[PDB]
Amino acid sequence: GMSDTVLTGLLDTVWQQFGRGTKDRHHPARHPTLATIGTDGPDLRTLVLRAASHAEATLEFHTDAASPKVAHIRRDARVAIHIWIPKASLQVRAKAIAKILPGDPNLFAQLPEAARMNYQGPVPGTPLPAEPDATPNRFTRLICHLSEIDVLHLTTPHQRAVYTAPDWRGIWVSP
Amino acid sequence: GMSDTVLTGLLDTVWQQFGRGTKDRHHPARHPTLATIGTDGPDLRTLVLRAASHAEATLEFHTDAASPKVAHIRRDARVAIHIWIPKASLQVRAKAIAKILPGDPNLFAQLPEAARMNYQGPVPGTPLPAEPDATPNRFTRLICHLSEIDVLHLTTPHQRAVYTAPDWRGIWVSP
Ligand SMILES: Cc1cc2nc3c(=O)[nH]c(=O)nc-3n(C[C@H](O)[C@H](O)[C@H](O)COP(=O)(O)O)c2cc1C
Ligand SMILES: Cc1cc2nc3c(=O)[nH]c(=O)nc-3n(C[C@H](O)[C@H](O)[C@H](O)COP(=O)(O)O)c2cc1C
């Protein structure tokens, strides 16, 4: 139960679950919570998971360049990502560096009008009424390069493992 | 609509959902996500909501005094609390100050041994095998004094409001 194979298997399962978030609108990994260091303490919010790569150790989100979270990352790129997956009895906590890249205008062109329109409205969080900004370039990628995965497995008894770059081997820790 | 009436009702809805969270184990508000400032960037994790007071604008969690989250809060009391409630189409983000208080020893006396063990044994996060920690009085209250609530209502289209202590009146903001 404690073997290296089990640890490896548990990490593979975590990445499998991220993968399901990219494929299934109804899975909890569809909607991870991203924390940033904000202007007066930590801040967090839901995003849609767009892509995941176990090999590259990345998770990808899309966001509005004009939004506060992007300003937070510009000043401090250190982020954390969380999912609670109760049907699988798994909590996943990840530490990452968030990198900001331009969005794919081919994807932007495929977005529904409402989504397209929302990237070109007021700055998110601005008190209404407010002026819009028709800049399609607001469409932005957040590529989160994971450095740590802490996974709690709420079986009997609880088990918890932590995996850290660069080794990513995994160690059992006390819940 | 965008009336004062709708604004007031939306914050009432938030507090009713926190209420459900204390009472119903299967409700998403049972398990909100708490963000802290950690040792190297932001951190977050799931806790169990134990109590909520609309009148005092507080949320209460129980935790192990020896856990890292407590150490985080010792260095920086600013925290954020998040719940995604898909069935209500609500995301709630709350800014708070966390106070760490002793637990009620009469309640600790009344907990099952499975529950009591959440506050015994090794220091959470310690690599195994881990020595039991002998600190007295590890059963701890984490009281979050809320200062701002940012509510996103994922209607078609979305509406979003921000409410601020001590009056909690609200303003509409851009999603
Ligand atoms: C279910 C759901 C999905 C969301 N998906 C995204 C998203 O993918 N990108 C994004 O920028 N915001 C998304 N949001 C909105 C954010 O949670 C947030 O309100 C907004 O991005 C502002 O965050 P900020 O003020 O920290 O920048 C989503 C919200 C909900 C609850
Ligand atoms: C469903 C569930 C409920 C949890 N409830 C609590 C709890 O209320 N108190 C607590 O300290 N940890 C709770 N945890 C475990 C924490 O999420 C976390 O692993 C532990 O408290 C350590 O956090 P820290 O390392 O930042 O201190 C819960 C985890 C799961 C997913």
Side-chain angles (χ1 to χ4, degrees), chain A residues 1-22 24-74 76-98 100-115 117-175, chain B residues 1-74 76-86 88-98 100-119 121-175:
Chain A
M2 302 303 287
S3 64
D4 287 4
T5 304
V6 175
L7 273 173
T8 292
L10 186 54
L11 183 57
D12 283 358
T13 299
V14 166
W15 282 102
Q16 276 163 17
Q17 299 288 293
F18 289 149
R20 291 317 298 169
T22 75
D24 177 5
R25 280 170 210 118
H26 214 252
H27 192 283
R30 173 63 165 193
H31 296 118
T33 307
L34 181 89
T36 47
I37 294 176
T39 56
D40 189 32
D43 200 349
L44 71 183
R45 79 288 289 162
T46 299
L47 290 93
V48 172
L49 184 59
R50 302 292 171 183
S53 167
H54 186 170
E56 292 172 20
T58 52
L59 301 175
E60 178 172 339
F61 307 98
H62 296 162
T63 198
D64 183 347
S67 68
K69 84 186 63 52
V70 179
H72 304 172
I73 290 164
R74 291 274 174 61
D76 190 341
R78 296 179 293 182
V79 299
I81 300 163
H82 171 274
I83 318 169
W84 168 228
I85 313 166
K87 295 179 66 179
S89 297
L90 296 170
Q91 181 183 207
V92 182
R93 303 162 68 185
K95 179 181 172 185
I97 300 293
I100 302 161
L101 289 72
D104 185 348
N106 286 336
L107 294 185
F108 192 73
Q110 285 188 340
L111 290 182
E113 315 311 349
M117 274 316 99
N118 296 173
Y119 282 100
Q120 295 174 79
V123 174
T126 317
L128 300 174
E131 283 176 72
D133 169 20
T135 299
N137 292 354
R138 282 160 70 181
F139 186 56
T140 298
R141 300 169 74 202
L142 296 183
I143 295 177
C144 299
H145 292 269
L146 280 54
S147 66
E148 187 181 280
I149 292 168
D150 182 334
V151 50
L152 176 61
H153 185 194
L154 296 86
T155 196
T156 312
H158 288 19
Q159 292 203 266
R160 191 182 166 188
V162 174
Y163 307 80
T164 311
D167 58 278
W168 288 116
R169 76 178 284 175
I171 61 171
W172 301 110
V173 307
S174 185
Chain B
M2 301 292 272
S3 64
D4 291 5
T5 300
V6 171
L7 270 180
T8 303
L10 179 60
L11 185 58
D12 292 339
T13 293
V14 169
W15 280 101
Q16 195 267 334
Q17 294 293 291
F18 289 151
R20 294 322 303 141
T22 63
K23 303 292 173 266
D24 178 4
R25 284 156 183 72
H26 294 309
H27 190 286
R30 174 59 72 101
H31 294 118
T33 305
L34 172 79
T36 53
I37 298 188
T39 33
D40 187 37
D43 202 349
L44 67 189
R45 81 292 285 159
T46 301
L47 307 170
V48 176
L49 190 64
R50 303 298 173 181
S53 171
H54 187 173
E56 301 301 329
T58 55
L59 306 178
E60 174 166 347
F61 304 99
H62 296 167
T63 200
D64 185 341
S67 67
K69 78 185 65 55
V70 173
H72 296 175
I73 293 161
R74 306 194 166 125
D76 195 335
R78 300 176 296 187
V79 304
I81 304 99
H82 171 273
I83 319 168
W84 169 226
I85 315 173
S89 301
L90 287 176
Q91 166 178 233
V92 179
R93 299 159 71 187
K95 178 176 186 192
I97 300 301
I100 297 154
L101 295 177
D104 179 342
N106 297 290
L107 177 48
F108 189 73
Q110 295 180 11
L111 299 186
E113 293 290 317
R116 284 166 60 98
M117 280 312 138
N118 304 335
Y119 319 94
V123 171
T126 306
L128 298 188
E131 180 76 355
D133 177 276
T135 310
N137 303 313
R138 282 164 71 187
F139 185 56
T140 295
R141 299 166 77 202
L142 203 169
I143 310 307
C144 297
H145 295 265
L146 316 188
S147 66
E148 172 193 286
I149 301 166
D150 180 348
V151 194
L152 176 67
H153 192 6
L154 292 86
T155 42
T156 306
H158 289 16
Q159 73 183 341
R160 182 177 172 201
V162 174
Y163 310 80
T164 300
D167 38 6
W168 305 102
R169 296 179 157 99
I171 59 155
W172 295 112
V173 305
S174 198

